[PDB]
Amino acid sequence: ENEDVNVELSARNIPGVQVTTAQGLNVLDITNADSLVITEAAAKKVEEVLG
Amino acid sequence: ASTGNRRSHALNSTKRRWNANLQKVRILVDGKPKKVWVSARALKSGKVT
Amino acid sequence: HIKKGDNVKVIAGKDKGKEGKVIATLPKKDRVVVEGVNIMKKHQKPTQLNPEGGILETEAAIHVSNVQLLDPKTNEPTRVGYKFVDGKKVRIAKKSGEEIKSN
RNA sequence: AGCUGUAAGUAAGCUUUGAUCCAGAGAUUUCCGAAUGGGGAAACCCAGCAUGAGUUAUGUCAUGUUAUCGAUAUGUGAAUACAUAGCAUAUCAGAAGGCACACCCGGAGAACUGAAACAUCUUAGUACCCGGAGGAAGAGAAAGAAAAUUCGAUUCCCUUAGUAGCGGCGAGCGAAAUGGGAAGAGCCCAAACCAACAAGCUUGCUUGUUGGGGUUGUAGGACACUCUACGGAGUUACAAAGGACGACAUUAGACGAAUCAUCUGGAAAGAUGAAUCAAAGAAGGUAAUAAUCCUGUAGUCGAAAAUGUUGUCUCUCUUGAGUGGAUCCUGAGUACGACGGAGCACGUGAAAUUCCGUCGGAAUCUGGGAGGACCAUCUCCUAAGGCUAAAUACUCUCUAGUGACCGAUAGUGAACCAGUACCGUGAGGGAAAGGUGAAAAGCACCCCGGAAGGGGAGUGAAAUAGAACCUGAAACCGUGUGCUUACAAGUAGUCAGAGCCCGUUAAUGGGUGAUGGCGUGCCUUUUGUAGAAUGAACCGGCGAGUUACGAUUUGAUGCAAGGUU
RNA sequence: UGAGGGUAGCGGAGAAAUUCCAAUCGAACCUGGAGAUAGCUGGUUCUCUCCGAAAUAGCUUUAGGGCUAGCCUCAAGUGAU
RNA sequence: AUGGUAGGAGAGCGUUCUAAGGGCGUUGAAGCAUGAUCGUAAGGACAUGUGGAGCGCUUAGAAGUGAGAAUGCCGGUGUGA
RNA sequence: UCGGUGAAAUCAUAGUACCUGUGAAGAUGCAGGUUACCCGCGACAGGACGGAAAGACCCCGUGGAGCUUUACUGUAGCCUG
Numbered sequence A: 001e002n003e004d005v006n007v008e009l010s011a012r013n014i015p016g017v018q019v020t021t022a023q024g025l026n027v028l029d030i031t032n033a034d035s036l037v038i039t040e041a042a043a044k045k046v047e048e049v050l051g
Numbered sequence B: 001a002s003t004g005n006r007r008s009h010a011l012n013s014t015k016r017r018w019n020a021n022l023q024k025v026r027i028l029v030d031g032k033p034k035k036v037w038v039s040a041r042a043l044k045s046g047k048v049t
Numbered sequence C: 001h002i003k004k005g006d007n008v009k010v011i012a013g014k015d016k017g018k019e020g021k022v023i024a025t026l027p028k029k030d031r032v033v034v035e036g037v038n039i040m041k042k043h044q045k046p047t048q049l050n051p052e053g054g055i056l057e058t059e060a061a062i063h064v065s066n067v068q069l070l071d072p073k074t075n076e077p078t079r080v081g082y083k084f085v086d087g088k089k090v091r092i093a094k095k096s097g098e099e100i101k102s103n
Numbered sequence D: 001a002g003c004u005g006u007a008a009g010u011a012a013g014c015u016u017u018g019a020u021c022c023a024g025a026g027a028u029u030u031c032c033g034a035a036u037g038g039g040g041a042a043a044c045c046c047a048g049c050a051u052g053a054g055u056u057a058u059g060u061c062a063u064g065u066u067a068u069c070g071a072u073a074u075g076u077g078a079a080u081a082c083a084u085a086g087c088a089u090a091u092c093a094g095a096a097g098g099c100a101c102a103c104c105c106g107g108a109g110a111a112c113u114g115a116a117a118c119a120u121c122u123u124a125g126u127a128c129c130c131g132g133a134g135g136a137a138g139a140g141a142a143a144g145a146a147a148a149u150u151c152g153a154u155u156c157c158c159u160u161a162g163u164a165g166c167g168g169c170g171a172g173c174g175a176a177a178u179g180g181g182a183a184g185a186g187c188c189c190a191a192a193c194c195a196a197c198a199a200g201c202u203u204g205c206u207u208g209u210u211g212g213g214g215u216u217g218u219a220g221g222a223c224a225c226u227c228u229a230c231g232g233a234g235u236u237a238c239a240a241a242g243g244a245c246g247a248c249a250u251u252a253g254a255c256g257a258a259u260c261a262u263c264u265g266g267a268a269a270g271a272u273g274a275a276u277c278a279a280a281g282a283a284g285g286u287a288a289u290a291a292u293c294c295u296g297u298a299g300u301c302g303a304a305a306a307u308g309u310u311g312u313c314u315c316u317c318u319u320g321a322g323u324g325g326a327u328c329c330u331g332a333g334u335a336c337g338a339c340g341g342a343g344c345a346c347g348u349g350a351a352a353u354u355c356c357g358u359c360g361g362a363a364u365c366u367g368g369g370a371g372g373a374c375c376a377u378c379u380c381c382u383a384a385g386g387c388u389a390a391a392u393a394c395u396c397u398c399u400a401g402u403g404a405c406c407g408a409u410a411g412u413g414a415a416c417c418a419g420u421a422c423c424g425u426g427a428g429g430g431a432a433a434g435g436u437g438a439a440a441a442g443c444a445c446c447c448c449g450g451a452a453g454g455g456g457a458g459u460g461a462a463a464u465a466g467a468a469c470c471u472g473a474a475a476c477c478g479u480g481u482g483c484u485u486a487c488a489a490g491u492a493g494u495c496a497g498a499g500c501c502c503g504u505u506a507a508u509g510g511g512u513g514a515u516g517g518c519g520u521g522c523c524u525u526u527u528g529u530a531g532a533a534u535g536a537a538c539c540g541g542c543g544a545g546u547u548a549c550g551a552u553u554u555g556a557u558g559c560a561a562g563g564u565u
Numbered sequence E: 001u002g003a004g005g006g007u008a009g010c011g012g013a014g015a016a017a018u019u020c021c022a023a024u025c026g027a028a029c030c031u032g033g034a035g036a037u038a039g040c041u042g043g044u045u046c047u048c049u050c051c052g053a054a055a056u057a058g059c060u061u062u063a064g065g066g067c068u069a070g071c072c073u074c075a076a077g078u079g080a081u
Numbered sequence F: 001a002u003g004g005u006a007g008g009a010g011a012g013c014g015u016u017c018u019a020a021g022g023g024c025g026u027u028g029a030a031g032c033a034u035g036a037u038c039g040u041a042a043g044g045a046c047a048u049g050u051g052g053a054g055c056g057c058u059u060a061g062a063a064g065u066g067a068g069a070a071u072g073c074c075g076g077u078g079u080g081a
Numbered sequence G: 001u002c003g004g005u006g007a008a009a010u011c012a013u014a015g016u017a018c019c020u021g022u023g024a025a026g027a028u029g030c031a032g033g034u035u036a037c038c039c040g041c042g043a044c045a046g047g048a049c050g051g052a053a054a055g056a057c058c059c060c061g062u063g064g065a066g067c068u069u070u071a072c073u074g075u076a077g078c079c080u081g
């Protein structure tokens, strides 16, 4: 949704994985990925700010 | 500064000075009465002899 | 990181699996030398105080990355950490306790 | 726990009593050079004064001192009498020179050029020169900008706008207000007036010294009128805690997880297989391509010069005194004007506005200035006194880093012996030149030879990797051979074609060529070039429509009476 | 004829020749403005496909340059002209 | 229908680099040399020798993107002999 | 001539004949004929419009410079107020 330093630090060192905020989404790191896991809150946030 | 131009009737320009009207007079500097240069406009009401 | 009077194993080279004792280190280019390891064959000429001499077989240096200490308990190859004791610093094995080495 | 610079090891040695090294502090620091005892052809010569060593004595040597201007304290005193000039001492070290002249402020100030010539204009207040200071400088608190019902001292950014305007109305030059924003700070003098101090004067007044007081307009202050001060507390100017002041960056520094085996190999980090760590899969080395071998990384713990300069921070602060303003004060050779000039977007003239020189030369609150000649009514302001942080400009430098930047004719002129060999009397100009190998294991020994060179042997994975050392192209120079050539006229090839030799990316193949036919190179410039018109000795390398900003027009996409920051 | 010195480029020196001022002078040399300007000359790098000129009026301090028209090409449109 | 210089339009080949994906390499990469191979062209593969560590392919994107000529610059090397 | 040492200008490639013609109007290279075994050395100078020097004569450039004057425009300076 906004920021989780713990999950960011957990996923930082894995290859292929990237971590982003709903506000900080970008087309490049969306399209480079093959899958997209969201939290429900982040999904609702992007839904409201893009709808 | 004291620099500018002299202009012709065809407005040709040449560099030129404007010199002050210095006069040598004996004034009373701090100490003795010294003979020194000074302008007429200056000694008009600016200094005594 | 090691010292002069240690017993170690060679990981990389023509000699690998071999053990040996270290006899010099040369830290400013990180190339130690070990007995029975990396043997040259120098052509010797007549020096001022010796005969001509044929070939000469002595040791040559070897990079430190190609050498590892041995756990004194298990005699297995192990890295080395550090432990502070009363302001003094000692070497540990990362699998067991202390490793004693003075010569 | 090794060490005795880059540049190597011998001989000598030093080192756990803590060396070499890494930061901080201190001592020493020859000579020249602003160079400063005098001189001088820089890195040299020649002195003196006072101490000290030595000397029977000098000689010699050593240690300090001896420049010019200036500041602070003194006496002094010629043509001519005290006085001062001037001169002579004691103390201090205040300046000089060099700036990074990149940025900033002043003084002085071009020409090529464009206008398709050229002179007003432009290039351009540019380049260069000189002087100043500084880490910033400059500007700065309305005698304003504007005409709303107004506004925030200065500076900077975006717009206004290539507009308004200037202009041989040509080339071209080119604002401002308004608005949106960054940063946001108003403080002190002179004069009135009051109270003391000394001299003239007779202490009445004046002069000057000190201290308060107050520095602003729909008028402020003094006198006239009226009742309050550390409440707040602010060192970026305007006063200050100088304060226990509570991580400089917490900076040198220290710790810092996790891998084994087999195959090929000269050597594996590679392939195969099985495991592990991850707040660490950034990067670089290691005999080849490594998250788990090394240095390291994330992260944690950390001390001197230190404090982050940050939080109540002792003292000290500013808890305001409101009305009329009637009288007094409110910056003089000033404002302003004429003449000649310059700067303002403005071409010198109606110059309104702001500066220089020469001549003149005022008003004082019922005053004065501005509002693009000038007059009147209205609006705004109150000059001729000063200081002022921030936002802003540049980088010889430093620390930490980054790149659809170069990779040895590139990129700095310079990856190495660089502003060096070299050239020039001198100012100045100014190169070429990188790569053995993992490891020096850098070829013991034998043979030819005066040696250089080589042939063996040997090291090595490799020696057509041997220091003229990675790869090793072409021009050029050679040695061998298969086909061919001494009756022949030639842009040297092309189409045809026997004979001879070979045998491929195996397909109606390759090499040579007795003989026949056709046939005057390339480029540029030209009406037209084989051209006796140009250019090229050959080979290699380098070597020319690009980028920014704006306009216009096509294509694409999004939205659409709206579109866009 | 020697040794020390002096005169410097909008200048100097010249028994005068445009003569000399570091192998150069009708205005020295080095740096900078400066990548001056050049309506002039030379050069300007890979391939195929489609179309395909002009060397002419007119104005020009203009004549080996330039502007507009003519003639070329590409794309839309009108649509018998 | 398809000759073509100034010139206009169009479609393509190669070079260096970047992103992503997917690959090749000491059982030997790029470079160099040879060849009787493929493609309408620019040009692309394969095989063998040499060499001894990096390099292709697909799609897109950026350019210091292609030399035989400039009395061109720098190096090597000839001719005259 | 022999022994030692050993350059340079120039140079599109070259197996580089003559006559009469042709042609950018003066040909080793073109046409038609004539002649001519391959390769050197010593000599000569008719041609290669030979080499050398982006013609200095001539014209052009809205290119420069030097000098002249009753060319235009200015000016240091001089005279007078």
Ligand SMILES: CC[C@H]1OC(=O)[C@H](C)[C@@H](O[C@@H]2C[C@@](C)(OC)[C@@H](O)[C@H](C)O2)[C@H](C)[C@@H](O[C@@H]2O[C@H](C)C[C@H](N(C)C)[C@H]2O)[C@@](C)(O)C[C@@H](C)C(=O)[C@H](C)[C@@H](O)[C@@]1(C)O
Pocket: G052, G053
């Ligand atoms: C000694 C040393 C010199 O000898 C000469 O000067 C000879 C003596 C000239 O004779 C002549 C002699 C004299 C009478 O001329 C015939 C005179 O008129 C000219 C000026 O110099 C020559 C040949 C000239 O040629 C002629 O120059 C003329 C301008 C055009 C003429 N053209 C027909 C092709 C051409 O051949 C021209 C200028 O010198 C040659 C240039 C390259 C030189 O300056 C060369 C390098 C000289 O330094 C030279 C070698 O050193």
